[PDB]
Paper text:
Aminoacyl-[name] synthetases (AARSs) play a crucial role in the translation of genetic information by attaching specific amino acids to their corresponding transfer RNA ([name]) molecules. To get structural explanation why the L219M mutation prevents [name] from misactivating Ser to produce seryl-adenylate, we determined the crystal structures of both the wild-type and L219M mutant [name] proteins in complex with ATP and Ala. AlaRS429 and AlaRS429L219M consist of the N-terminal nine-stranded β-sheet structure harboring the catalytic site (residues 1–241) and the C-terminal α-helix bundle (residues 242–429) responsible for [name] recognition.
The N-terminal fragment of [name] corresponding to residues 1–429 was used for successful crystallization. Their structures are referred to as AlaRS429 for the wild type and AlaRS429L219M for the L219M mutant. According to the superposed structures of AlaRS429 and AlaRS429L219M, the side chains of Leu219 and Met219 are situated in a hole formed by Pro167, Met206, Glu209, Pro220, Ala221, Pro222, and Ser223 (in motif 3). However, there is no difference in the position of Val204 observed in the crystal structures of both AlaRS429 and AlaRS429L219M. Interestingly, the B-values of Cα atoms of Val204 in AlaRS429 and AlaRS429L219M are 19.96 and 26.68 Å2, respectively, suggesting that Val204 is more flexible in AlaRS429L219M than in AlaRS429. Unlike the previous study determining the structures of the post-activation states, our structural studies about both AlaRS429 and AlaRS429L219M in complex with Ala and ATP depicted, for the first time, a visualization of the spatial arrangement of both substrates prior to the activation reaction.
Author numbering:
A (entry chain B), B (entry chain A): 1 to 425
């Protein structure tokens, strides 16, 4: 089953159950100058959940484009290192605005995974907040799932809050078990962080409200916000362990491999490049341009990290913008604004890669020389600062190179150099 | 080697190296109204490290009484469940106020452990911050420790900051390996939290200054603060795996066993009672009295949790204050104020146990009845609030009973009940 078929089936399943299918919001948040990029389906509905905005539907469903490259939800460093993390991904979500609550949300998700998608329950694993007896009863006594594939988890993973004040409540999560050929343990075990038991669907129950003085009260109309990664469930439905092996990435990875002259289609730097073109092209299409401040600098950082991975692969000629075309062919039916903006996106990414290529090769020679002469395992702060200040290397780009060689960078020493520079500038 | 001999050998070792041996400060912090209790040897010297207070010595050593039962980390819930956690413990520390730095600090610690204490290097394990090449070079190239018993760890465990602003810097830690008979893995492994590799000594290097804007600059006079748990090194030096098996706790546990009429010195509630008399008696000796606010409520909570464990053991008469006498006999030479205050401490703890005994028996009947009839795994919030509001059960005491029966408590439901109560007023 293709990713496009899963996306369409998800939305139709919830439309049949009375959910208004709404378009994805932009990656640039409209009403939040404190959020870098839209990072969940919830973002555009935040004022509805708060009761600050009224809409003519009380349940909705979206496939929301998200980027997690900043804040605590920063998966940029996991890209290329796990089977399950992207910068750009689509979050399939259903929302209840004071309408249904835990019973329907749990039944909707279980019906979709086990009935519409036909996933064997023996491959699924469920977690609840360990103080949420309602969710546990619904799962164990109503749905009647296997209680040996069930974990009760504390507030760090399974209790959610919109902020210090505002709505909060427990969460329940559904995981897919990729089997004994993948390292890792089930949720709650010391090895839960492995790629074997992958979190597929997170259901948030807005149950309580905390006021400015800290009082907790019950929400007058409890609400639901859920989120499932399209790529992870597509991997499940296409029989592969890594998100990068699904249909949606095949043309991207093949094109990058051709541009690098390689047959190693599983190469981690090709996967990084395929991930980064998605976030970079969609970010530009949503109006972000490279810069040295704010949202433009996150875009600049990801673009330049993609260029460096091409350098690592031996690519000698401008290449990154050539992946906009297979991306738009693959995803343009779902995201026509990408097709409409394709030429402008290519021009922005070409220009940025050319700007960085002015200094990349010379900066890489310095780095390679540093590693060759290095006594310890830490690239020194003055070298990091030199690459940043003279060669346009973001610190995290240098650190990404370093980690490929089992090295770290001296972040504190770099910050000391920055402070010394501010005094001189 | 007895705990008192280790304490004295530690202080003398550093006195021989020019350290002013200074007395422990009180458990009640004087110059930090946001800290509940003194939780490290650093606390009384914070203003010296900050340069706000001048002293006639630039290097020092203390055996500091600490309580960690609130705030960050908070080890109250670990007491009785691990070989290594207390509420009250003594932290052996050496301090450099802009004097020596990483090299001396590392050699001082390795000399004390491997030469003064004679601990085999093969039983020790060292961690450094993974960006601290100075610490790594000193250990590996100067001291020349076994590089296979060495871990590079990230900023969460091996980078320290005094606050959002102020001094910060890398840490290096020394662990003792209790061997194959104890579960757990080395620092940095998924199973690092086990009791096999126990952290003995933490060395903090104040190397940088972070300002209100987030900028780092080098500290004008780098400084050192170290801390080593007396009980953990005493277990090592006495050939036992658990803190509760050292000389000080052999006496306390045996006395508790006599009060409970049992020969089963391995009963976990005896270890809890033995730990809690230390925190409760020293807190009272330092002038804290039970109350329903602030520091007095933490004392009240620990006292009442100790009483609840006596109830679990079947103790039928007022008992907790009777452990003050063996505590004073065991620790009174090092802490004469405990001897001076012994009768006052006894009276305070007796009165609190008597005040609580008015309702403990009835509340326990409710709790036992609730457990017998309970559907699910969560004690409901209204029962939690009843036990709190009418029977004087702190929420964490009820939760401590609950986990003994594989149960949790509904904290959010309790807070809802508290808000409902405020509304009725
Ligand atoms: N970086 C990512 N790459 C790919 N898929 C992701 C990524 N982040 C989240 N997802 C998918 O989106 C779903 C919803 O994300 P969300 O962050 O709300 O849940 P969560 O990961 O449990 O939250 P938290 O980690 O903060 O507890 C996840 O269950 C996962 O399937
Ligand atoms: N609750 C406790 N019970 C017994 N010993 C303790 C306790 N907390 C700390 N110690 C001992 O005191 C030493 C110094 O503790 P300190 O808090 O400075 O370091 P830490 O515990 O590594 O800090 P972190 O909170 O970052 O883990 C520890 O290495 C340990 O030997």
């Amino acid at each position: 089953m293709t990713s496009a078929e899963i996306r369409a089936a998800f939305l139709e399943f919830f439309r049949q159950r009375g959910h208004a299918v709404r378009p994805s919001s932009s990656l640039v948040p409209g009403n939040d100058p404190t959020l870098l990029f839209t990072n969940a389906g919830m973002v555009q509905f935040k004022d509805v959940f708060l009761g600050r905005e009224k809409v003519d539907f009380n349940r909705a469903a979206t496939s929301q484009r998200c980027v997690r490259a900043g804040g605590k939800h920063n998966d940029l460093e996991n890209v290329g290192y796990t089977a399950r993390h992207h910068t750009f991904f689509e979050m399939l979500g259903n929302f209840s605005f004071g309408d249904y609550f835990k019973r329907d949300a749990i039944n909707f998700a279980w019906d979709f995974l086990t009935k519409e998608m036909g996933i064997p329950p023996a491959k699924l694993w469920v977690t609840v907040f360990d103080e949420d007896s309602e969710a546990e009863a619904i799962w164990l006594e109503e749905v009647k799932i296997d209680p040996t594939r069930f974990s009760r988890i504390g507030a760090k993973d399974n209790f959610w809050a919109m902020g210090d004040v505002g709505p909060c409540g427990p969460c329940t999560e559904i995981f897919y078990d990729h089997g004994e050929h993948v390292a890792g343990g089930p949720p709650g075990s010391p090895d839960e962080d492995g790629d074997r038991y992958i979190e597929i669907w997170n259901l948030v129950f807005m149950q309580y409200e905390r006021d400015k003085d800290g009082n907790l009260t019950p929400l007058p109309a409890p609400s639901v916000d859920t989120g499932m990664g399209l790529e992870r469930i597509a991997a499940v439905m296409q029989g592969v362990h890594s998100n990068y092996e699904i249909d949606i990435f095949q043309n991207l990875v093949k094109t990058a491999a051709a541009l690098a002259g390689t047959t190693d289609l599983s190469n981690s730097s090709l996967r990084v490049i395929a991930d980064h073109i998605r976030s970079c092209a969609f970010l530009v299409a949503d109006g972000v341009l490279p810069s040295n401040e704010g949202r433009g600098y996150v875009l600049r950082r990801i673009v330049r990290r993609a260029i460096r991975h091409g350098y690592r692969l031996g690519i000698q000629d401008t290449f990154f913008y050539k992946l906009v075309a297979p991306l738009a062919a693959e995803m343009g039916a779902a995201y026509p604004e990408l097709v409409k903006a394709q030429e402008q996106v290519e021009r922005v990414l070409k220009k940025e890669e050319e700007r960085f290529a002015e200094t990349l090769g010379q900066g890489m020679k310095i780095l390679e020389n540093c590693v060759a002469k290095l006594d310890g395992h830490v690239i020194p702060g003055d070298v990091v600062f030199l690459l940043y200040d003279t060669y346009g290397f973001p610190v995290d780009l240098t650190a990404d190179f370093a980690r490929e060689h089992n090295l770290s960078v001296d972040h504190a020493g770099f910050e000391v150099e920055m402070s010394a520079q501010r005094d001189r500038a």
